[PDB]
Amino acid sequence: TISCTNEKQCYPHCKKETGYPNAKCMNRKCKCFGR
């Protein structure tokens, strides 16, 4: 998926995607816990 390192990297990723700021960054990939 995207390319990040720290979990704070997917903060704006999931926030603007689903609307939840809770996101994680593992293996350069971002996940949204606010599905």
Curated annotation (Swiss-Prot):
* PROSITE patterns cross-referenced by the UniProt entry: SCORP_SHORT_TOXIN
Family annotation (SUPFAM superfamilies):
Scorpion toxin-like
| Transmembrane regions listed in the UniProt entry | none
Q: What GO cellular component entries does it have? A: extracellular region
Disulfide bonding pattern of the chain: 4-25, 10-30, 14-32
What family is this protein classified in? Belongs to the short scorpion toxin superfamily. Potassium channel inhibitor family. Alpha-KTx 07 subfamily.
- Recorded protein name is Potassium channel toxin alpha-KTx 7.2
Give the species this sequence originates from: Pandinus imperator
